[PDB]
Design a protein around this ligand. Structure first.
Ligand code: MG
Ligand code: ZN
Ligand code: ZN
Ligand code: ZN
Lengths: 133, 160, 86, 773, 65, 264, 114, 43, 196, 180
RNA sequence: AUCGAGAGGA
């Protein structure tokens, strides 16, 4: 029920595509220079510009309904500022000791590449994503 | 015609080949010619292939013509349907056409055939020859207002 | 024409119950039901003769026999108890 | 043929049709006047007497009611005019002709009734207007519009008749059409355009609209799905809400020409356990297409689940769209200035090419291409240029249209529209044709009295540079009139020719019924086919799947199926089995695997000998491509644990599974050889999928899931078997008559005239040819 | 055949505007657009009721019975 | 002033009231618009008993016209629904009996205006059923025309009702209703071929809202509260009492809900 | 010739009651209320004001068919909150808002000069 | 009424489709559909 | 139907509240589907809307003759100078909610006609009644409370499903049933039968 | 119309004739009638066979000399490149029939659409005669409130369409809305 | 009512 991943990514490629409310971002980890990812970001909600520094986190909690945040008694699990919730749909193995994970947050896609989340990410629908400015 | 052929590696590849299309048709002499492959020739007329290359080849040429006219519109119908139609046109010696000449003059009952053409002359010739109708066909048991030998009536139901 | 039956041990027709014979069976049952005939199941609160027939069929309580006919004149007799339903 | 083969009947009705989404699929909006008219005889029984007595007491002038009452003596009792309208007390054995009521099964039919699927049962829903309402997804097997179309409704009069309607001619059973081996009904214009703009990446839904959308779906559990956005505002995706109607356990995998698993263009379509993961929804997915969502849901979950799937998608998408809106306007016909200048510069370059060719051919410097004369070479070189210019200008227009051009979005949805529509409305309507050639010379050596004689210019033989938006000139308008007249007359002729063709078809094959020995025959006892469809399978329960053993290189095939239990690097790695190291050596199993591989290579050569063109995608009964997914998700396989299968398990299980895929059941070697031949394609497929290396490496099955696969495959095979009694002659004649009606107009007789040369044996064919190799 | 009481799409009283309409362009020599504006008809849903209206009753009356 | 929905009125007349609704949810303003249109009772003619018709028109033509004439219904609340009352067909406390009698004496065409409707039933002292005449010349609304010798003689029993049962009771003309004119809320994707700015025009109310500057990102948790409305009346009820009685009618609907809950 | 009498849109008939309550199936603390002879006018307003309440998990309305004058509303609440109380309080908030609106409006109109 | 007053009929080799001579003497658009399309023309 | 081959029935009648509406408080008389536009290429409809709106505002008559040099661009200039959008869209509000329609909608006046086919003139149903004298069959025609022809095309239809009992009911129990006595020696309907 | 040499190729009609014609049309002097044009040799009667021997211009603006600035939204009419003229058409809109003269912009539709409308306009409800109240025909249907269209073909003026119209200017919105 | 001819409709 605790965090499964933490890293610091500096973005490299920003691409609006054909849309107007979303952007494909291709970012790379800093000083851990073998894990790279690509992510569909709602620009209207989190206006991620080019060449930024964004902290990326992956959680597994914090079925039943989703009641809206009722009061402060519902304590958030996020000092971050942009949170999504999706599902795994494939785990690609590009090369030996180089894995890739595939996440889908209801259309908005993410691909992550590297070999150091190995013990954490599973083929479980439960996968929260957190982004800090 | 960029025909598909297997390479020695097993992988298919398009091998281009030169093909000859005609504005006329005479099969009896074209295949018996040096320089060609008399095993791959095809005529868009099936009724010449029925005479030259036996009957099953004519059946296949007819089916291919039908599939061509359906594929012209991009449509696709399943092989059992056209196959039933074709092999019906071929379940006799040669091409039994689908006109008043062809299948129509069969002995398929007497009240059956009196519902397509020559509606009166058929009854006349059947009274003459004194035909006996099995009354197993659809149209006979329909005209009799009986439950026709259809899927629902392909059997009988008794008590234990 | 004389005794064109087939002994049960040696039969070759499809052992499943096709939608045509099944539909005719349900219809015969609904017919005799709708005209006040007894019922062979503790009916779970249903009144429609067709659904009564469907539940009876699911419970293998229909004493009807299908005489599957062939071209040669011979035939086969199959029980509703025999005929599998899928 | 006027009073015996077909006749007017009682218990009938007919009126105008209209579309109402809030009806399910197999419902029919029936007016109240009709239901006051039409009757159904019912027998008084202790199940119904309490209701039927009240029904009588209600009288005949308001629904629910009843009109006539029959006793055992047979004297009809007229409730409309009698003394005992309210005094009546029914003793048993009696009949009441009640008004047709809700959930009654009735036949709904459209003239002209060509398809077997155009006379379908329907469930009555009594509505307060005077039109037949129905679902928009049933416009396919009727070819209806709501433009004045009217249809007919017949009522059964016996309980077995109600059964025949509700169990054979019902709508949900007619989703899958035997012709084309694919569903006939699909998602239609309005729902489709909605489901597109609903499912974009960009389209996000707020809270209140999401909760209403959820409540709209009838069969809903109350689990408010977690949104895709959490922190700034809990937004949902159109996919994340749309998934709520797609039932649990539906998987769908499709790729569209650019489909990385990133889907950089949202192409393709992924559906995981009944939840859409990525990909736009358009006709390729939810349409009436092959292997779409209706196809899969109909095969897997059943007819009723698919009907409710129709209902739910409709009720959701129409709601969303109603609150988001859509229009067409003319702004969607105006491309940019520079685009229009490029368009007319292209047309001018085409005109100058034509004029160069003309002044060339006027100097007899024409290499008259072989086979055709001078003037024919010229006509081809000019018509080719004009049509190339038209299509190039249309492509320029479609390039310049923006993403929000509403016509472009109806094009992308597939609801209504094409590309050539765009080319004509905005770019260039093109050159018209009468009897094949250009606008003929009506006057002596000229087309119209406004031109010099002998004017072979593009502008004189019918070319229309001006798009529909700019405006046609008088001459061009008249040439378009000449073209459209030929269009109208060809339509009116080919319609009737198709009608007579199809009548001849039906009346030729009308008695062809699959008898109980699976031998297609007719009234005389003649045999047409000894096995129906040459495989004994129904046209329904058939899906297009790939014969994967064919195609690809030999060495890759060896890597994909060859297991050498006697090698270091060609054996099943112990990572894939508990019995990995134990099985090394053990020639007693390598003989079995060698036999497997010999049979597989035999089948490879066999298929490459049959399907010479190398096409593997072909129609077969059981879709293993989906059953493997069902297994991988039903027993929760993880691709990490070793299997618990001996190789003998897989091999002997397959080999005795083949021995149960019965089609014919006879006890003799002739019928047995017929059956052994008549499943050879399916068994080739089976081995191509259920291969030891392929099984244990590509889908790491357990024992439980494996035996479940081997039972469900037998089940679907025995269900896909064609059913004795099917009148296949009418079915085939219709399957070939309907798609012919939709045909119309490089020199050969193509379409209907080819058809009438084919059916009636035509010794004077208008275009024989001899393609020789 | 006669001037409607109210417009078909908004519901404003447009009948009282007819007798004036003619005399605004027949006496005051106005234009149809300005002679519609000066009457309080601004939304075109009302404008089209008085502009497109054909008073046929003037011909219906010519008949004696 | 009082707590809650604040209103700033811009222009007002006997014809239309143009104002601003402020600090309300959207659904409340929408419901108010709909109830202002077609749920406040008025009065108009619901039966026409014709005796002599020599006009060039039909009887039901003139009937349909008569139903549509606006009638003064300020004091409508003292009049009861014809279905509610106990009378046989219609009485004085439940209906108003206008009548009409015209004859074409003149050689010229004789018009039949609205003011020619003569009241017959007892008013019992209330402002009810006066044919509303807002013409600048005194003449009512033109019903029919007459040649020499063509007479008309009918009576009209006007009962109470609302615009749902038929649109003749419609007391509201056209409700201007705009909100977020700059579209700072992104409630609509503007269609464009060159620029969403130059092609669509500046709304009238754009001066009453603070312009957004292209630098500030989008206010993603703002919800619409400010609306810009205009109510036009036909004449049966003045513009003020239209919106007042519409609000009273919606509150009455909620009150009937609450008493049904009590019955439960 | 088959169309209803118009007044059926807003007047009940033959024991058709104004409100009917049904506990929802497959929902913890929830209810679906069949209104009768009401339209979007009341339904969307009640739903919005219910969504203003911070103790309600779920609230939404629908008109299953526009031929008929009816609309159903479903509400799911917290524990201890019989959803009828949430409906009551939302409705009373609506009525008080409308009253303050009418009062402010009469004030401003009397202030207006015409 | 005005169309019916100007309507033709042709009894019955391609007499149906529109012809270059029909310019100005016969409507190119106005004609019935289906049976006898192009036979019945309006000047 | 419009004046450009756009046929159409009336799906339903909406009251004025439910209807969408623009900012001016104007409400459509007609709501037609967009999808019927591009498969027919009726540009005169879409242009006519523009011309009618421009002439309705201006107070002139919209010259719509063919072969006149009327640009859509001049119409757009005019409709821009009249304070409207250039290509004829207009922001509309949903009538149920009032939430801005994300899609602005083509809105304008346009000529329409009422074709002579009313449903009350078309509707028809028959349970039982008059029957022909010779054929003992249901008579033809609504004017006589006639019956509907279960023609042989529809019979070809019903055969594919397998419903034989339905055909027997349709052909005898629904119409022209008859009971005939016959002889075993002479297989004709010549035998005499005194029933009572 | 007749084209001849005056100078050069010019039609025989002239603006003074239009002056006299419309001045006669206003008196509603020696009236200038269609017969006055015909008996003056300014107009001829060409049948189908005769037009095989003449060259007809379509618009009189084909007679100006030619020797730039243009509206790109205007239609693209070709330079006629002909100078051996004998006649000029009256007006091409006159090739249409009575029923296809009601459609606006019939040059902007697909000809099947115009034929379908030609056949449907004969069905429309409206005023067929001002004396419907006297004539007792078997079937009469009259539109309560006819309206003259806002889009008018010029040829309606001679078809009396704006005096006996048979339709109404419905406020049309092209929208997806509730799927009915 | 029977026969035949017409204009229309999907
Ligand atoms: Mg149609
Ligand atoms: Zn208006
Ligand atoms: Zn009273
Ligand atoms: Zn005898």
């Amino acid at each position: 029920s605790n965090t499964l991943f933490d890293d610091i990514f500096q973005v490299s490629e920003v691409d609006p595509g054909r849309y107007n409310k979303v952007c494909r971002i291709e970012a790379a980890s800093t000083t851990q220079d073998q894990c790279k990812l690509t992510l569909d970001i709602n620009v209207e909600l989190f206006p991620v510009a080019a060449q930024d520094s964004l902290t990326v986190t992956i959680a597994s909690s914090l079925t039943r309904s989703w009641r809206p945040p009722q009061a402060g008694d519902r304590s958030l699990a996020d000092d971050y500022d942009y949170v999504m919730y999706g599902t795994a749909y494939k785990f690609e193995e590009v090369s030996k000791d180089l894995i890739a994970v595939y996440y889908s947050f209801g259309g908005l896609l993410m691909r992550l590449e590297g070999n150091y989340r190995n013990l954490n990410n599973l083929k479980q629908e439960n996968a929260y994503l957190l982004i800090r400015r | 015609y960029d025909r598909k052929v297997p390479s020695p590696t097993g992988e298919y590849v398009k091998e281009p080949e030169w093909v000859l299309e005609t504005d006329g048709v005479n099969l009896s002499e074209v295949m018996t010619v040096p320089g060609i492959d008399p095993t791959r020739i095809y005529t868009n007329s099936f009724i010449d292939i029925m005479e030259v290359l036996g009957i099953e080849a004519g059946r296949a040429a007819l089916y291919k013509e039908v599939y061509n006219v359906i594929a012209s519109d991009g449509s696709y119908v399943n092989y059992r349907h056209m196959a039933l139609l074709v092999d019906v046109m071929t379940t006799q010696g040669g091409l039994t056409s689908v006109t008043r000449h062809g299948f129509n003059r069969s002995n398929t009952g007497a009240l059956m055939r009196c519902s397509f053409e020559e509606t009166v002359e058929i009854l006349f010739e059947a009274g003459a020859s004194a035909e006996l109708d099995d009354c197993r066909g659809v149209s006979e048991n329909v005209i009799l207002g009986q439950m026709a030998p259809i899927g629902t009536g392909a059997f009988d139901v008794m008590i234990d | 024409l004389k005794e064109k039956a087939i002994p049960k041990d040696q039969r070759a027709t499809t052992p499943y119950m096709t939608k045509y014979e099944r539909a005719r069976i349900l219809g015969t049952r609904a017919l005799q039901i709708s005209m006040n005939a007894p019922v062979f199941v503790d009916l779970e609160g249903e009144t429609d003769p067709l659904r009564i027939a469907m539940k009876e069929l699911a419970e293998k309580k229909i004493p009807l026999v299908i005489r599957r006919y062939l071209p040669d004149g011979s035939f086969e007799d199959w029980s509703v108890e025999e005929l599998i339903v899928d | 043929r006027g009073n015996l083969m077909g006749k007017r009947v009682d218990f009938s009705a007919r009126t105008v049709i209209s579309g109402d989404p809030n009806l399910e699929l197999d419902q029919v909006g029936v007016p109240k006047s009709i239901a006051k008219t039409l009757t159904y005889p019912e027998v008084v029984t202790p199940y119904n007497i309490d209701r039927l007595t009240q029904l009588v007491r209600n009288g005949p002038n308001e629904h629910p009611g009843a009109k006539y009452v029959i006793r055992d003596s047979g004297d009809r009792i007229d409730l409309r005019y009698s003394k005992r309208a309210g005094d009546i007390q029914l003793q048993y054995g009696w009949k009441v002709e009640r008004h047709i009521m809700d959930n009654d099964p009735v036949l709904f039919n459209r003239q002209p009734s060509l398809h077997k699927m155009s006379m379908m049962a329907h469930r009555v829903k009594v509505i307060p207007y005077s039109t037949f309402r129905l679902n928009l997804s049933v416009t396919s097997p009727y070819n209806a519009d709501f433009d004045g179309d009217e249809m007919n409704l017949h009522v059964p009069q016996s309980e077995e008749t109600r059964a025949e309607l509700s169990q054979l001619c019902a709508v949900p059973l007619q989703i899958v059409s035997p012709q084309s081996n694919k569903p006939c009904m699909g998602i239609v214009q309005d729902t489709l355009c909605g489901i597109r703009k609903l499912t974009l990446r960009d389209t996000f839904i707020e809270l209140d609209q999401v909760l209403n959308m959820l409540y709209w779906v009838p069969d809903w559990d109350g689990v408010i799905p977690t949104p895709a956005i959490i922190k700034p505002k809990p937004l949902w995706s159109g996919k994340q809400i749309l998934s709520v109607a797609i039932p649990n356990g539906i998987h769908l995998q499709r790729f569209d020409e650019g489909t990385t698993l990133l889907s950089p263009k949202d192409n393709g379509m992924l559906i995981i356990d009944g939840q859409i993961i990525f990909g736009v929804v358009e006709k390729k997915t939810v349409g009436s297409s092959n292997g779409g969502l209706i196809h899969v849901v109909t095969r897997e979950k059943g007819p009723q689940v698919c009907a409710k799937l129709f209902g739910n998608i409709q009720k959701v998408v129409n709601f969303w769209l109603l609150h988001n809106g859509f229009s067409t306007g003319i702004g969607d016909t105006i491309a940019d200035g520079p685009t229009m200048r490029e368009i007319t510069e292209t047309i001018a370059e085409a005109k100058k090419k034509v004029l160069d060719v003309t002044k060339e051919a006027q100097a007899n410097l024409l290499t008259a291409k072989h086979g055709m004369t001078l003037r024919e070479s010229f006509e081809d070189n000019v018509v080719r240029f004009l049509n190339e210019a038209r299509d190039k200008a249309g492509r320029l227009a479609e390039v310049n249209l923006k993403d929000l051009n509403n016509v472009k979005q109806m094009v992308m949805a597939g609801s209504k529209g094409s590309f050539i529509n765009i080319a004509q409305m905005s770019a260039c309507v093109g050159q018209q044709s009468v009897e094949g050639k250009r606008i003929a010379f009506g006057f002596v050596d000229r087309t119209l009295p406004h031109f010099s004689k002998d004017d072979y210019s593009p502008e004189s033989k019918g070319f229309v540079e001006n798009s529909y938006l700019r405006g046609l000139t008088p001459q061009e308008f008249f040439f378009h009139a000449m073209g459209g007249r030929e269009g109208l007359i060809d339509t009116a002729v080919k319609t009737a020719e198709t009608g007579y063709i199809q009548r001849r078809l039906v009346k030729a094959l009308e008695d062809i019924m699959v008898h109980y020995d699976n031998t297609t025959r007719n009234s005389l006892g003649n045999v047409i086919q000894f096995i129906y469809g040459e495989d004994g399978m129904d046209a329904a329960h058939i899906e297009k799947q790939s014969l994967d053993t064919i195609g690809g290189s030999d060495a890759a095939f060896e890597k994909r199926y060859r297991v050498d239990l006697l090698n270091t690097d060609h054996t099943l790695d112990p990572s894939l089995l508990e019995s990995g190291s134990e099985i090394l050596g053990d020639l007693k199993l390598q003989v079995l695997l060698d036999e497997e591989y010999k049979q597989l290579v035999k089948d490879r050569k066999f298929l490459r000998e049959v399907f010479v063109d190398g096409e593997a995608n072909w129609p077969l009964p059981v879709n293993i491509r989906r059953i493997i997914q069902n297994a991988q998700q039903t027993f929760h396989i993880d691709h990490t644990k070793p299997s618990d299968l001996t190789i003998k398990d897989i091999v002997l299980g397959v080999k005795d599974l083949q021995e149960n895929l019965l089609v014919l059941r006879g006890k003799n070697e002739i019928i047995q050889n017929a059956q052994r031949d008549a499943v050879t394609l399916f068994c080739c497929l089976l081995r191509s999928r259920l291969a030891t290396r392929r099984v244990l490496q590509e889908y790491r099955l357990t024992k439980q899931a494996f035996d479940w696969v081997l039972s469900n495959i037998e089940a679907q095979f025995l269900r896909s078997v064609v059913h004795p009694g099917e009148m296949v002659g009418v079915l085939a004649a219709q399957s070939i008559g309907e798609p012919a009606t939709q045909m119309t107009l490089k020199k050969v007789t193509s379409g209907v005239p080819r058809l009438k040369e084919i059916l009636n044996v035509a010794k004077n064919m208008k275009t024989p040819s001899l393609t020789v190799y | 055949m006669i001037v409607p009481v109210r417009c078909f799409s908004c519901g404003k009283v447009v009948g009282d505007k007819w007798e004036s309409y003619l005399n605004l362009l027949q006496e005051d020599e106005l234009d149809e657009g300005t002679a519609l504006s000066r009457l309080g008809l601004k939304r075109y849903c009302c404008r089209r009721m008085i502009l497109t209206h054909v008073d046929l009753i003037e011909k219906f009356l010519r008949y004696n019975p | 002033s009082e707590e809650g929905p604040q209103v700033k009125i811009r222009e007002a007349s006997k014809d239309n009231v143009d104002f601003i609704l402020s600090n309300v949810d959207l659904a409340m303003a929408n419901s108010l618009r709909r109830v202002m249109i077609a749920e406040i009772p008025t009065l108009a003619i619901d039966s026409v008993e014709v005796e002599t018709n020599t006009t060039v028109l039909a009887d039901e033509f003139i009937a349909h016209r008569l139903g549509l004439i606006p009638l003064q219904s300020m004091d409508i609340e003292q009049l009861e629904y014809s279905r509610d009352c106990f009378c046989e067909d219609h009485c004085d406390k439940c209906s108003v009996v206008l009548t009409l009698q015209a004859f074409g004496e003149s050689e010229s065409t004789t018009n039949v205006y609205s003011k020619d409707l003569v009241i017959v039933s007892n008013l019992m002292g209330r402002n009810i059923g006066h044919p509303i005449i807002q013409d600048k010349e005194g003449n009512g609304v033109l019903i029919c025309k007459l040649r020499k010798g063509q007479e008309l003689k009918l009576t009209c029993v006007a009962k109470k009702g609302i615009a749902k049962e038929h649109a003749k009771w419609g007391p509201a003309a056209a409700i201007e209703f705009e909100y977020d004119p700059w579209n700072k809320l992104k409630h609509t994707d503007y269609w464009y071929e060159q620029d969403s700015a130059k092609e669509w025009p500046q709304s009238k109310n754009c001066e009453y809202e603070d312009p957004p500057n292209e630098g500030d990102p989008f206010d993603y948790k703002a919800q619409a509260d400010t609306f810009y409305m205009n109510v036009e009346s036909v004449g049966s009820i003045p513009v003020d009492q239209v919106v007042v009685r519409g609000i009273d009618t919606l509150q009455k609907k909620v009150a009937s809900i609450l008493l049904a809950l009590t019955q439960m | 010739m088959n169309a209803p009498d118009r007044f059926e849109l807003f007047l009940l008939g033959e024991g058709e009651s104004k409100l009917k309550i049904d506990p929802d199936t497959k929902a913890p603390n929830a209810v679906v209320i069949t209104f009768e002879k009401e339209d979007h006018t009341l339904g969307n307003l009640i739903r919005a004001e219910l969504l203003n309440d911070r103790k309600v998990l779920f609230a939404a309305y629908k008109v299953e068919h526009p031929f008929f004058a009816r609309f159903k509303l479903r509400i799911q609440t917290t524990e201890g909150y019989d959803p009828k109380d949430a409906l009551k309080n939302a409705c009373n908030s609506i009525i008080n808002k409308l009253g303050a609106l009418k009062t402010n409006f009469e004030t401003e109109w009397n202030l207006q000069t015409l | 009424t005005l169309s019916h007053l100007r309507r033709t009929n042709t009894p019955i080799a391609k007499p149906r489709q529109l012809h270059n001579t029909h310019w100005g003497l016969v409507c190119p658009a106005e004609t019935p559909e289906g049976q006898a399309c192009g036979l019945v023309k309006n000047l | 139907a419009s004046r450009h081959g756009q046929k159409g029935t009336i799906g339903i009648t909406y009251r004025r509240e439910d209807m969408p509406f623009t900012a001016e408080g104007i409400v459509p008389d007609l709501i037609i589907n967009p999808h019927a536009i591009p498969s027919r290429m009726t540009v005169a409809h879409l242009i006519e809307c523009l011309l009618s709106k421009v002439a309705a505002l201006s107070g002139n008559e919209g010259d719509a003759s063919p072969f006149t040099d009327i640009t859509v661009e001049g119409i757009s200039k005019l409709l821009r100078e009249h304070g409207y959008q250039s290509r004829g869209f207009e922001v509309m509000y949903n009538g149920h909610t009032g939430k801005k329609l994300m899609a602005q909608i083509f809105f304008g006046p346009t000529y329409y006609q009422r074709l002579r086919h009313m449903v009350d003139d078309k509707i028809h149903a028959r349970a039982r009644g008059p029957m022909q004298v010779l054929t003992r069959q249901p008579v033809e025609g609504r004017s006589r409370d006639g019956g509907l022809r279960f023609g042989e095309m529809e019979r070809d239809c019903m055969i594919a499903h397998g419903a034989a009992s339905f055909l027997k009911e349709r052909l005898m129990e629904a119409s022209d049933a008859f009971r005939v006595h016959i002889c075993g020696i002479c297989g004709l309907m010549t035998v005499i039968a005194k029933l009572n | 119309f007749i084209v001849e040499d005056d100078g050069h190729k010019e039609l025989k009609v002239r603006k003074g004739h239009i002056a006299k014609l419309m001045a006669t049309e206003y008196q509603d002097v020696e009236e200038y009638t269609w017969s006055s044009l015909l008996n003056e040799g300014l107009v001829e009667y060409i049948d189908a066979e005769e037009e095989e021997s003449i060259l007809i211009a379509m618009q009189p603006e084909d007679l100006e000399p030619a020797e730039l600035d243009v509206d790109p939204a205007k239609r693209i009419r070709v330079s006629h490149h002909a100078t051996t003229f004998t006649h000029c058409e009256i007006h091409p809109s006159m090739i249409l029939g009575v029923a296809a003269s009601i459609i606006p912009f019939p040059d902007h539709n697909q000809s099947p659409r115009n034929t379908y409308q030609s056949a449907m306009g004969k069905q429309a409800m409206g005023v067929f005669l001002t004396n419907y109240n006297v004539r007792m025909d078997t079937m009469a249907n009259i539109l309560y409130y006819p309206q003259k269209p806002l889009g008018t073909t010029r040829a309606m003026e001679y078809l009396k369409f704006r005096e006996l119209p048979a339709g109404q200017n419905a406020i049309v919105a092209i929208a997806c809305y509730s799927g009915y």
